[PDB]
């Protein structure tokens, strides 16, 4: 759970106590990581990038420099430089940290998923050519990256291999919405059936 990690760790930037506590250097990095995941673009801007405290700490730890790069390049919609940044963030930040060793793999998956999301929303169609070149990989590599997240139903998109395009088919309509609703009521109908019956016997 990173949602509670981002609420505490971003707040603790602003009035931070080091009297029988840990360094600000570890916390500013650890805070950026968990904010990147949980916050969406609008709140990303408010609470990470336009954070005065994070600004003032500047680039003085290699760790700090690594995660800072990554959020900016996600934000400003650049893709060329995102692919090598991601690799550096993992090497210098996630691993040395004991606690993010455990969340190392998840970071890589989600991070690609997040940059795809922004691109997929904003476009109806892409080429396999243009998308690959833009992130800074190839046609053969892109096809594998996408075969991870699409069968898990994250991105809601198909790739026309025949045509050479990446088609977008993210539902935003009523059908998508109705499905969410019935999943809430079906967990209710079952839970009534168990509590109701059980009392009926005794």
């Amino acid at each position: 759970n990173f949602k509670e990690a981002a609420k505490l760790l971003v707040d603790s930037l602003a009035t931070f106590t080091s009297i029988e506590l840990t360094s600000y250097e570890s916390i500013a990095t650890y805070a950026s990581v968990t904010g990147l995941f949980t916050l969406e673009r609008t709140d990303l801007k408010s609470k990470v990038i336009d954070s005065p405290e994070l600004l003032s700490l500047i680039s003085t730890t290699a760790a700090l420099q690594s995660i800072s790069s990554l959020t900016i390049s996600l934000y400003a919609s650049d893709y060329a430089s995102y692919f090598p940044y991601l690799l550096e963030t993992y090497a210098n930040v996630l691993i040395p940290c004991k606690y993010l060793n455990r969340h190392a793999d998840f970071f890589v998956r989600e991070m690609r998923r997040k940059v795809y999301a922004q691109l997929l929303e904003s476009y109806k169609t892409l080429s396999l050519k243009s998308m690959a070149s833009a992130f800074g990989v190839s046609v053969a590599f892109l096809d594998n990256d996408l075969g991870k997240f699409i069968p898990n139903k994250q991105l809601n998109c198909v790739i026309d291999r025949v045509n050479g395009i990446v088609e977008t088919n993210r539902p935003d309509n009523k059908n998508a919405q109705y499905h969410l609703l019935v999943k809430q009521g079906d967990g209710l109908l079952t839970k009534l059936q168990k509590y109701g019956a059980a009392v009926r016997l005794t």
Partner: protein, 217 residues
């Protein structure tokens, strides 16, 4: 003291209160002896004009400029950079601006503040210019867009993505068929959203009942 309060406000995106500080600051440095304070005065002159560029006033540029001393005792490269960019902006022409900052690059490079607020000004005019083009069309070519704005195609496409996430006309771009479709329709229905709160609550409630009703067991 006054100038520094000026810079800070200009940056907070308030340009009236900012303007009065830079006005004072211009007057202070003109009235002190000029040995190094002309330099500081010229810099401030760029910032008074800069406040008003952002408000989109060229009347009050006419009032502040004068051939008495603000173009004959402070005749400089920054003046020529300002009335180019001022004039460009009103025309609603990004082309013109683009050409004005090519030959006045040194003004962006030397001035931190001038640059922050010209970065904003760029984004603002491009955003404005776009809305007008895409209102009366749908299924407009991305290539067509490039003709009117005066930018490379590849640039236009990256810029427009951001403004879908910015979420002021939010459509979808066709890279492979080279169209833009504009969608401006509602992205939820009200009864469905109020339903979400309602079934969520019932999920909790049934657990709570059972806690009270487990006395039978």
């Amino acid at each position: 003291l006054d100038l520094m309060s000026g810079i800070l406000h200009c940056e907070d995106k308030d340009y009236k209160t900012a303007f009065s500080y830079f006005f004072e600051s211009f007057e202070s440095y003109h009235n002190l002896t000029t040995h190094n304070s002309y330099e500081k005065a010229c810099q401030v002159l760029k910032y008074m004009l800069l406040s008003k560029i952002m408000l989109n006033l060229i009347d009050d540029v006419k009032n502040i400029l004068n051939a008495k001393y603000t173009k004959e005792t402070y005749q400089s490269r920054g003046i020529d950079a300002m009335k180019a960019v001022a004039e460009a902006y009103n025309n609603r022409s990004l082309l013109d601006f683009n050409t004005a900052l090519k030959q006045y690059e040194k003004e962006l490079m030397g001035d931190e503040l001038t640059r922050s607020h010209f970065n904003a000004l760029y984004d603002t005019l491009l955003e404005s210019n776009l809305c007008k083009i895409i209102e009366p069309f749908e299924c407009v070519e991305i290539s067509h867009i490039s003709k009117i704005i005066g930018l490379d195609t590849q640039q236009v496409e990256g810029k427009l993505s951001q403004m879908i996430l910015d979420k002021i006309f939010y459509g979808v771009l066709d890279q492979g068929n080279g169209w833009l479709y504009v969608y401006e329709t509602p992205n939820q229905d009200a009864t469905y959203d109020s339903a979400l709160e309602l079934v969520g609550q019932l999920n909790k409630v049934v657990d709570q009942l059972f806690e009270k009703a487990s006395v039978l067991y």
